[PDB]
Amino acid sequence: DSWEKPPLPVYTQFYFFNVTNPEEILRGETPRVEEVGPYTYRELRNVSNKAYVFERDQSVGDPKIDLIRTLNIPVLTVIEWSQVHFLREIIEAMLKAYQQKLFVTHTVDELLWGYKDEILSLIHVFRPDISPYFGLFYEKNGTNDGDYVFLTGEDFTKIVEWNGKTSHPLITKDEVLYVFPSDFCRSVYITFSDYESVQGLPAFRYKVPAEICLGSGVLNVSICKNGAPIIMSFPHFYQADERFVSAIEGMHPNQEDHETFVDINPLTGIILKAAKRFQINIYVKKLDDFVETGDIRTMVFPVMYLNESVHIDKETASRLKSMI
Amino acid sequence: DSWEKPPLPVYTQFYFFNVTNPEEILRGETPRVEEVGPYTYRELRNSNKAYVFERDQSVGDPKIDLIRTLNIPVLTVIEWSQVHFLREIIEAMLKAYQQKLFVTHTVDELLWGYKDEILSLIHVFRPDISPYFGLFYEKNGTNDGDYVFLTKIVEWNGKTSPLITKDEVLYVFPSDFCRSVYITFSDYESVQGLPAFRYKVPAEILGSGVLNVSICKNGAPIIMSFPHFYQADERFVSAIEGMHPNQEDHETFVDINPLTGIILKAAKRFQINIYVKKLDDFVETGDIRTMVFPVMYLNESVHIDKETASRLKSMI
Ligand SMILES: *[C@@H]1O[C@H](CO)[C@@H](O[C@@H]2O[C@H](CO)[C@@H](O[C@@H]3O[C@H](CO[C@H]4O[C@H](CO[C@H]5O[C@H](CO)[C@@H](O)[C@H](O)[C@@H]5O[C@@H]5O[C@H](COP(=O)(O)O)[C@@H](O)[C@H](O)[C@@H]5O)[C@@H](O)[C@H](O)[C@@H]4O)[C@@H](O)[C@H](O[C@H]4O[C@H](CO)[C@@H](O)[C@H](O)[C@@H]4O)[C@@H]3O)[C@H](O)[C@H]2NC(C)=O)[C@H](O)[C@H]1NC(C)=O
Ligand SMILES: *[C@@H]1O[C@H](CO)[C@@H](O[C@@H]2O[C@H](CO)[C@@H](O[C@@H]3O[C@H](CO[C@H]4O[C@H](CO)[C@@H](O)[C@H](O)[C@@H]4O)[C@@H](O)[C@H](O[C@H]4O[C@H](CO)[C@@H](O)[C@H](O)[C@@H]4O)[C@@H]3O)[C@H](O)[C@H]2NC(C)=O)[C@H](O)[C@H]1NC(C)=O
Ligand SMILES: *[C@@H]1O[C@H](CO)[C@@H](O[C@@H]2O[C@H](CO)[C@@H](O[C@@H]3O[C@H](CO[C@H]4O[C@H](CO)[C@@H](O)[C@H](O)[C@@H]4O)[C@@H](O)[C@H](O[C@H]4O[C@H](CO)[C@@H](O)[C@H](O)[C@@H]4O)[C@@H]3O)[C@H](O)[C@H]2NC(C)=O)[C@H](O)[C@H]1NC(C)=O
Ligand SMILES: *[C@@H]1O[C@H](CO)[C@@H](O[C@@H]2O[C@H](CO)[C@@H](O[C@@H]3O[C@H](CO[C@H]4O[C@H](CO)[C@@H](O)[C@H](O)[C@@H]4O)[C@@H](O)[C@H](O[C@H]4O[C@H](CO)[C@@H](O)[C@H](O)[C@@H]4O)[C@@H]3O)[C@H](O)[C@H]2NC(C)=O)[C@H](O)[C@H]1NC(C)=O
Ligand SMILES: CCCCCCCC/C=C\CCCCCCCC(=O)OC[C@H](COP(=O)(O)OCC[N+](C)(C)C)OC(=O)CCCCCCC/C=C\CCCCCCCC
Ligand SMILES: CCCCCCCC/C=C\CCCCCCCC(=O)OC[C@H](COP(=O)(O)OCC[N+](C)(C)C)OC(=O)CCCCCCC/C=C\CCCCCCCC
Ligand SMILES: *[C@@H]1O[C@H](CO)[C@@H](O[C@@H]2O[C@H](CO)[C@@H](O[C@@H]3O[C@H](CO)[C@@H](O)[C@H](O[C@H]4O[C@H](CO)[C@@H](O)[C@H](O)[C@@H]4O)[C@@H]3O)[C@H](O)[C@H]2NC(C)=O)[C@H](O)[C@H]1NC(C)=O
Ligand SMILES: *[C@@H]1O[C@H](CO)[C@@H](O[C@@H]2O[C@H](CO)[C@@H](O[C@@H]3O[C@H](CO)[C@@H](O)[C@H](O[C@H]4O[C@H](CO)[C@@H](O)[C@H](O)[C@@H]4O)[C@@H]3O)[C@H](O)[C@H]2NC(C)=O)[C@H](O)[C@H]1NC(C)=O
Ligand SMILES: *[C@@H]1O[C@H](CO)[C@@H](O[C@@H]2O[C@H](CO)[C@@H](O)[C@H](O)[C@H]2NC(C)=O)[C@H](O)[C@H]1NC(C)=O
Ligand SMILES: *[C@@H]1O[C@H](CO)[C@@H](O[C@@H]2O[C@H](CO)[C@@H](O)[C@H](O)[C@H]2NC(C)=O)[C@H](O)[C@H]1NC(C)=O
Ligand SMILES: CC(C)CCC[C@@H](C)[C@H]1CC[C@H]2[C@@H]3CC=C4C[C@@H](O)CC[C@]4(C)[C@H]3CC[C@]12C
Ligand SMILES: CC(C)CCC[C@@H](C)[C@H]1CC[C@H]2[C@@H]3CC=C4C[C@@H](O)CC[C@]4(C)[C@H]3CC[C@]12C
């Protein structure tokens, strides 16, 4: 019966890359992908937990019907496990007993929130700690998720958002912002881009700088993701080596749609407007046994990208300025 | 009100290596250890194990007796820092809260659990990470137990009431199913009158005779060995003063009745070690030598009694 509406409306939109030529990929050709999206989810805040409410009117189609053909992330994870000698004996045996495919078709809702994987369910009979369920956002609905932004510079360390924060120092263009995810695995630092105004209020625009085998502009986030072969990128390999783009037909990056930014009011430390824009990729290579990978090229294969956005409205901006 | 006595009495005895020269180790000298034990625990069952302490069959009280050995939680988190898992947080709190590489705790604290300062801190950020550490933490009362295969099954956590030949090999799984070990026929034995086959871990299984198990242990730097580096490279022994291996006390064996497949008598004898090396980013380590440092070894033993043996022979 709980879950309230946040002070500023936050929305996460998912965009999936549908694999149009799977048999052609296995025979060594360049992948051809087709971007399907958005699948708009409105955030809700009740500690502080968030819930995702689907908005069909603001989405491309129904995620409970719409199918996406992409890579089988569970088998590549359990293969990676096999290699580092974690459950090799079992994993090998069931991958031999139950032939799995590299390319798999599922509903958007199945990829996003969860599906029961054949091989994982088998592993679970032995290891009850290993979930049979897989999803890019599995069990993330209703949990105390939320990034952490910190201020730096010289000595100065101001916290702007600890899971979530709204309504002192001289914040300057010289200060850097350190951002951690819910899980604190790795950090990303965003530096001052320029001075902006947001619904009249002054703001400093922060952007991920150019300063951040394999190739530039991608982040191997494998340790944070239970050994799953996951690479991080900006949507469409924006700000990443040209090689990454040319590798996958369907990628067309541009700054206006694929950049990450966050406009913060200095005085208050309030985020007035922002866009969390990142892409999940899978590092795919040709492999000796179990799959069925064929003569696949070694590449950073895109699965899906998202946009987590917020924008202060005309009213709440003039109500915030009224509280001064 | 539950927990019954197993059909054959099983006992786990713990033996700890007490570090006599910690400051000397940090300055680069050879470690000097002193073996403290046994701490005898009688196993209880009702598929789930339960360890009951036997003071009368032990060296001292584990709730009083202290052991000075390595801070496994700091060594683990340092290893996480390196593989770039929570580098930023781990580094920051190791800087804010100066930790020692050598730490003193009660036997019961090392065995069943203690709250670690750094893990408690990490738990504030990562609720999925336990603040509690113990070599056997949360293992009391759980459905633990090995699996022994021939393709007939002798075990499956535990088994009693299979025609084995000297040619057959036995495959063993540890329940966590991480890795396997195979035991081959050593010789012919008699156990309480019953014929048996003595099965031993062969010579066929960093340096030889040690097993790296970091993946099975949440990235914690853990090496497995036989007690006192028995059947392992001499270099391993010479590295640590205090190690004196011998077959009679440190070998692992298992006497199986050829007809029924029943284990009549056996010794599960293994040692937990930590791979410790000197690191420049962690002042904690000093100028420590790169070595496979022993923490503790155990003996999980079973032996059929005069009565149950003559009751088993009666069923023939
Ligand atoms: C028991 O078993 C365990 C577990 O099974 C064994 O664990 C091993 O523990 C070590 C701990 O030090 C760990 O190594 C560390 O991790 C990285 C791997 O280093 C090795 O591999 C390097 C090859 O990768 C590089 O290759 C190209 C250059 O030739 C190029 O593509 C890259 O530079 C690439 O480096 C990468 O860097 C990224 C970080 O960037 P992003 O995430 O994209 O932002 C890493 O994520 C990625 O993993 C990769 O390494 C090779 O060059 C190197 O020489 C090693 O052979 C290194 O980053 C670490 O580097 C550090 O090495 C020194 C010593 O540790 C440090 O003092 C120094 O500061 C430096 O930073 C480091 O080597 C193993 O990965 C880990 N293995 C597993 C399976 O987890 C353990 O060894 C066993 N113990 C015993 C007792 O035997
Ligand atoms: C992402 O890319 C993937 C891969 O191309 C797309 O997935 C395909 O999506 C279509 C629907 O758009 C799926 O097609 C459906 O197949 C069903 C199963 O086939 C049966 O029927 C044939 C005979 O016709 C038998 O030979 C076969 O064995 C099965 O018994 C059909 O039931 C569906 O039929 C209906 O089609 C349309 C609606 O799509 C109706 O108008 C018709 O009247 C008819 O009732 C349908 O053809 C197909 O299965 C998917 N492929 C895979 C690999 O699963 C994604 O849709 C695409 N997503 C986006 C949004 O681009
Ligand atoms: C969350 O993040 C995503 C960013 O990835 C946003 O979605 C994008 O939204 C922008 C607008 O907010 C869209 O941009 C506009 O696209 C129009 C059509 O583009 C399609 O068609 C062209 C061919 O005609 C293709 O080349 C292209 O690939 C698209 O498929 C354009 O007509 C628009 O042009 C107008 O604006 C520009 C501004 O730079 C002017 O210069 C022009 O003159 C013109 O007036 C514009 O480019 C974008 O297409 C959306 N992408 C996706 C994938 O959905 C979300 O909106 C963002 N934020 C929120 C809150 O939702
Ligand atoms: C679980 O596993 C451990 C093995 O680590 C067992 O504990 C050992 O038990 C054996 C006996 O079962 C002990 O061996 C005996 O030790 C006596 C004293 O040894 C100490 O002192 C000598 C010097 O006097 C040192 O060299 C040595 O390192 C010890 O510190 C000896 O007097 C015994 O000798 C007798 O038996 C041998 C058998 O080979 C005969 O040849 C001799 O003639 C003589 O009669 C014997 O060696 C051993 O010390 C114990 N070790 C520890 C660390 O406790 C558990 O018993 C085992 N099983 C069960 C079910 O618990
Ligand atoms: C060799 C070592 C092996 C170790 C094995 C140990 C046991 C493993 C058990 C199960 C896993 C099996 C399947 C493998 C899963 C692979 C990981 C995965 O799935 O990778 C996909 C996504 C990608 O991440 P991303 O791009 O979204 O994030 C970006 C975040 N950055 C910044 C860190 C990059 O990972 C996600 O999203 C995560 C989705 C799952 C989240 C679960 C936790 C939910 C939150 C709180 C706890 C409560 C849950 C329990 C139930 C409570 C109610 C009863
Ligand atoms: C880079 C990747 C990082 C991933 C991080 C993921 C989250 C990690 C979370 C917490 C761990 C933090 C502390 C680090 C612990 C290091 C591991 C450890 O501690 O290493 C010590 C001992 C050594 O093992 P060993 O020599 O004895 O075995 C020999 C077995 N071989 C044959 C496989 C070699 O490890 C043991 O013993 C294990 C002791 C703990 C056992 C807990 C499970 C108990 C059983 C069943 C589940 C029920 C528990 C929950 C409560 C239920 C009631 C409410
Ligand atoms: C992204 O980061 C991940 C994790 O940080 C990183 O993972 C590395 O993957 C390889 C997978 O093969 C691991 O290397 C193996 O380690 C085991 C255990 O020690 C060995 O048995 C393996 O040996 C075989 O395979 C080798 C393949 O090169 C052969 O050379 C060898 O002869 C054997 O046949 C192998 O050495 C490696 O340990 C992990 N690292 C970690 C930290 O887990 C991955 O490389 C990064 N991905 C990208 C896209 O850069
Ligand atoms: C393993 O090695 C460690 C490290 O050497 C060793 O720990 C030490 O144990 C002694 C006790 O044996 C501890 O000393 C005690 O310290 C407290 C606190 O100050 C005092 O109250 C005690 O005083 C009594 O000391 C004698 C008895 O020990 C009495 O005769 C006397 O009258 C005093 O009342 C006592 O000094 C010491 O704290 C630890 N060291 C560390 C680092 O904690 C451990 O006991 C060894 N274990 C075995 C079984 O070998
Ligand atoms: C995420 O969790 C929220 C909260 O549980 C879900 O939203 C509610 O779901 C119930 C299901 O009975 C329905 O009444 C409504 O659809 C939602 N209620 C409100 C008040 O919004 C949400 O659907 C979950 N998201 C996903 C993807 O499963
Ligand atoms: C392991 O668990 C068992 C079972 O809970 C413990 O043994 C019992 O503990 C209760 C505690 O109130 C006492 O009645 C007795 O000491 C035990 N009862 C029986 C019937 O044996 C055991 O102590 C635990 N071991 C450790 C090391 O904590
Ligand atoms: C892995 C790399 C390439 C991605 C970089 C992380 C970027 C996209 C993150 C780090 C911190 C993030 C911000 C942190 C806080 C919030 C408040 C929330 O209510 C909406 C999203 C918003 C406004 C985020 C927008 C995007 C942001 C700036
Ligand atoms: C890590 C390596 C070096 C250790 C090798 C594993 C050895 C020690 C294992 C494999 C199978 C095991 C046996 C399997 C079954 C039982 C029955 C149980 O009621 C007591 C322990 C006992 C009798 C085990 C003793 C030790 C044993 C022989």
Numbering used by the authors:
A (entry chain B): 51 to 96, 112 to 220, 225 to 236, 257 to 301, 318 to 429
B (entry chain A): 51 to 96, 113 to 216, 226 to 236, 258 to 301, 319 to 429
Reproduce, without paraphrasing, sentences from the article in which this PDB structure was first reported.
LIMP-2 is a type III transmembrane glycoprotein encoded by the SCARB2 gene primarily found in lysosomes and late endosomes. LIMP-2 is a receptor for the trafficking of glucocerebrosidase (GCase) from the endoplasmic reticulum to lysosomes, where the acidic environment activates the sphingolipid processing capability of GCase7. LIMP-2 belongs to the class B scavenger receptor family that also includes CD36 and SR-B1. Taken together, these results establish LIMP-2 as a lipid receptor.
First, LIMP-2 in our structure forms a symmetric dimer (root-mean-square deviation 0.98 Å for all Cα atoms in the dimer after applying twofold symmetry) via contacts in its two highly distinctive regions of the protein, the α-helical bundle and the region that forms the hydrophobic tunnel. Second, clear electron densities for one phosphatidylcholine (PC) molecule and one CLR molecule were present at the hydrophobic tunnel within each monomer. CLR is completely, and PC partially, buried inside the hydrophobic tunnel. Compared to the reported apo structures, each LIMP-2 subunit has extensive conformational changes that accommodate lipid binding and facilitate protein dimerization. Near the PC head group, D272 and helix α-9 (residues 270–274) are flipped out of the channel to anchor and accommodate the quaternary amine of PC, while K330 and K205 are shifted to contact the phosphodiester of PC. The displacements/disorder of 9–10, α1, α10, and α11 make the CLR site a much less restricted channel with large openings that connects the distal and the proximal faces of the dimer. The expansive mannose-6 glycan, P-Man9GlcNAc2 at N325, makes intermolecular contacts in the dimer.
